[PDB]
Each structure stands twice: as structure tokens, then as C-alpha cells.
């Protein structure tokens, strides 16, 4: 250990409120068992006696600025941060490899780096031969489709507004130029934002679901079309919104265009008139005109062949849902309830939908149970009827969302047989607010799951690198997320309990919290309980520790739709769409948690049947400013992307990788001609066996030396000393 690196004139990184880290030289040599550190930025950094932990060391210049983050010798947050910052600001480079990962910082301006000249430079090349570019990732995907006879997936994660739609477009521009999909898929984006995005406390245009777009190729490996799948939809949002948040964009679009002549009939008020759209107390997004955004959505529908008729159907269904949310209930007693007579909301529901007020009014307040003997109808509480109303709304929405996806798909599908595909996934990354609820819990769960599948891919490839290089592959450690995932999704886990409790007549938020404690507290390290509360739990997620408020969890998870409620609607006539939506019983007993898990294992299956490549998209600042880099936002983004964990894992094995030549040709000056044999590979072994005495700071393989973190910076320092 000794630690003869904290010398005098050695750079380190210390913390900083405005920049997160400040670069700080040295004045005095650090003495073992010291407690100080004199620095001329001038202060005396004082470490804490128990931690006795030194600030992270800075990297030597030959490595600063590198195209690959895992060629830094000191792999830590500052180095990563500093490296991304100088490339972006000084050199205007948006793309940086992180091992097999592409990091893409959104520059908030159009760059002249996507033309045919550049495309051509990248066709044929191998990964890493050239400078990092989204095109390189496309090339790999395309090249490998052809040589492995196997479909590929490019996963593009990050917060919406971070440049994922740009990344997908240029993967498509690239695919279409080395082999009219791109124009058609981008024309669909506004259809898909209107129904799947929504304002939250932290993004005015957050995407609440995963979009996978399979780009189809023929046997001559040319593009023929596209097919979109979707997963992970936040159904909760359709009927509940937190303070400051909104329902899906399309609902608000519709209610700010209520006065339009052809929506007279939908008798829409403004967005504060509807239960399903006013809970957040903020119907207008500053700088956003919901009425203007509606014309883009229809234009988009028109452009993917959705007829003005079917379009009118969409908004008929949606006005439907809104009005449904206003159906009020009066309970007769704990066990039953009724809809007031001559009740406006359901009058309008029923006129729009094309059904009988009375038959609806009835199955809104009753329930058909069936047993082997026979069947019977019972009344149901005001509460169970809210839950059924909401479930119906959610079910209408979900199936309207699938309807609209099928019909985009018809505009995208090709007749030519398809031999293979490359799917671009547009998924979110980690989400933490000051207050966290069911929705964040779902995003984070998906994120552990996408992180595990990434870790296991990297780990396969490392094992493969080791076999080739003739180092024993079992020497590679795995950093496993399966315990956090079981804690969430396995028998007796968070979601299983949430299900159980939801079925208990007396079960509430506080009684589920208690089952969480009695089952996991002090019995699972990934599970903490805040010392000062009984209504919150904590999960040690890979990227960060997250506190969840239990409020709302039991209601949001419930999702039992009643078949009688459906069949009423499944039988309209004054309206072609509505019955189309519903063209069984176990599937809709299922909670939102449970459906989420199914959608998520659907998504993993899809990706596991393919070779994945990875792109991480970050926002450098909070205002869409061109080439501007805010350190606090950068770290948060890289963290929520998994890049900081990716880099930690890397930093714990043998990240630096020099070929024997690269090494001889850098460190020739460090050896004496006496020890320079005719065998190059053997000289280096001997030479380095002297220069670094401890043997497990590096592994010798066939063609490369593999180094521990800091060993190249050590080498480079004694190249300067001389």
C-alpha cells in the first residue's frame, strides 16, 4: 500500500459545492498517519480520523482526454467527470466510449457530424478503430446481424430530453444508407408523446413507458420496414396524479381544444373540470400550448393513415374516459352504493360511448361472482366501485394505446419477407424525487433488471476476452443485483406483499408497511426503514439508495376490471372503434405491479433473444443551452444512467489494457539496453516485474498486459521523475 503518490506537486480532487470537484495540487508531502493536506488551489484539507480516506488522485495528461473512459488509470467520479467535461466543452465531442457503452451528451444544437461522408468513414471499420460515434454502434449492430445470423438490440437509456430520439434517428439514417422507415417512424413521435408522455415534477415531457422499434431487414440485409412494440406503461397515471403533475399530454390537448366545432359533442370542459386531469393542480405547462400541440398529433395520425373518422373515435374514447372519472357514487351502506338519478357524468359517458345509462349504472354498482354451483350478482361498496371505475378507465386507455400502436404499425410494416431486425429500445433510466411512490418504484425495479442484464453481458465478454488471452476466466468477479431484484419481485418480496395486502378487506398502506418491516427489516441488507417514520421504506438500489413513501401504494396497485363493465361497452354500435379495442378473467384480476412484472419479463425475453449494444444519453444542463456543462447535473445523469456503477465495477478489476508493443514503445525509455531481450513480450514481463513489485497489480496475457487501476498512472509518473 505505502501510498507514495500523495507526494508534493501531486494533483488530487477535493469536493466543491458549485463544481462538485476542484482540482488541487500539493505543497507538503503527505506523511503516513497524518491528518492534513496543504493545498494551493490555499487551505489544509482535513480528512476525518475514522475514515482516514484520501481524496481521489488525478490522472496524468497523456490519459486525460481519452476516447474511452475505462482507459483512465484512476477510475472515479472526478476523472470521469473531468474527462467528459473537457471533451465536450474544449473539443465539442458529444460521444465517449465507456468500454462497450456509448455516452452521448446532448449538445442542444445541430452538429454537422451525420452526413454521408461520415457514414462512409464508419462502414467497414471495427469498433474502436475510429472515434466514438452513434454510427459506430450501428455499424457493430449491422455487421454482427450479418455475420452471426442473429437479431440485435440497441438500448438507449436516460431521461427524456437527453437526446434519445436523435440517437435513434441517426441509427436509422445510418442503417438506411448502408443498405422509407426513418421519415415514417419520426412522424409517429407526436402520437406517441401525446399518449405516453406526461409532465412530472421534474420533466415537462417525461416518457412513461418503454418503446422498442424493430427495424426490419430482408435476406439481402436491406431495410424493408419497422415494427414498434411497447412495454411498462404507467397505468396509475390515467386516474391519479401527484401534486404538480399531469395525466398524459393527450388529455390536456383535448380539453384546451374543447371549443372546436367538432368537439362540441364531446362536451369537454377545461382540464380543471375533470377528476382524471386536475389532481395535480397545474393544467398548463409554462411555454406549452396544448391546443397547438393537438394539431400536430392529428397531423401525425393523418400522416400514418389514421382516418379522420378513426381519429374522432380516439377522442370519443378519451372524452369518454374523462367523463367516466366524474361519475360520483353515494353509498347506501358499507356494502353497496348507487349512482344518483339523472346524473350528468354518466349521461354523457353513455351518450358518447353508445350504451344504456341503466345497464351501465348497474354494473358500475354490482358484481357478478361465479362458483361451480352457479352465479350471483351482489352489490358493492362506494370504495370497491371507485376501484372498478378506475380499473375500467385504465383498461380503456391501455387498449386504446395498443389500438393506436397497431395502426401506426400498419403504416410501418412491409410485405417483403423479413429475415432479421435491429431493435432500438427507448427506455428510461433511474428516477428519484424528494417524494417517491409506486411509479418510481416501478421504474427503478425495471432499472435493476436492465442493469443486471447489462452486467451479465459485460461479464460474458470479459470471460471471453480472458479465454482468448489465456488468463484463467474464473478470476473475474461479478457484482450481482439479483438480491435487490428478489427483494422486489420474489415470494414475500415488496410486490408480492403489496398484492396480498390488496386482497385483505382491512388491509391499508400502514398495515402493508408493517408486513414489510416484519418480513425484511434486519433480515435483508438492501432494506432499511427510516428511523423517524412508519410510512416509508428504503431500497439499496445499485445506483443509489431510495426512500419510498407508502402513501398511495395499495390504491395504485389495484386494477381489477369487471367483465360486466366491459361487455356493456363491448356491445356499443353507434361507434365502430370501441368494440375494436376489446377483440381473460385471470389477466384482469392482476394488479399493476404484477402486469408490470409481466411486461418487464416480456421485455427482457425480447432483449435476451438478441445481441445488445448500449447507448447512455445525458443532459448536461437544465435549460436546453448549447454546449454547456453543469457538473451537478452531469453527475446526477451519469449516476441515473448506470455509468457510475459501470465504471466502479470496471475500476475493481483490470481496466487498463496495453498490447506488449504499445507498452514497449511507451516505456522503452524506462528500461536499460541490458535487460532489452530479442523477445519483446518477455522483455516487458521482466522489466515490469522490476518496476512494479507486487504481482497481482497486473496479469500477462497472450497479446496484452492487463493493469489494475492506478498502475498506468504510476508507470507514467516514473516516466516523468527520470
UniProtKB/Swiss-Prot annotation:
<comment type="function">
    <text>Processive actin-based motor that can move in large steps approximating the 36-nm pseudo-repeat of the actin filament. Can hydrolyze ATP in the presence of actin, which is essential for its function as a motor protein. Involved in melanosome transport. Also mediates the transport of vesicles to the plasma membrane. May also be required for some polarization process involved in dendrite formation.</text>
</comment>
<protein>
    <recommendedName>
        <fullName>Unconventional myosin-Va</fullName>
    </recommendedName>
</protein>
<feature type="region of interest" description="Actin-binding">
    <location>
        <begin position="600"/>
        <end position="622"/>
    </location>
</feature>
<comment type="subunit">
    <text>May be a homodimer, which associates with multiple calmodulin or myosin light chains.</text>
</comment>
<feature type="domain" description="Myosin N-terminal SH3-like">
    <location>
        <begin position="7"/>
        <end position="55"/>
    </location>
</feature>
<comment type="similarity">
    <text>Belongs to the TRAFAC class myosin-kinesin ATPase superfamily. Myosin family.</text>
</comment>
<feature type="binding site">
    <location>
        <begin position="158"/>
        <end position="165"/>
    </location>
    <ligand>
        <name>ATP</name>
    </ligand>
</feature>
<feature type="domain" description="Myosin motor">
    <location>
        <begin position="64"/>
        <end position="720"/>
    </location>
</feature>
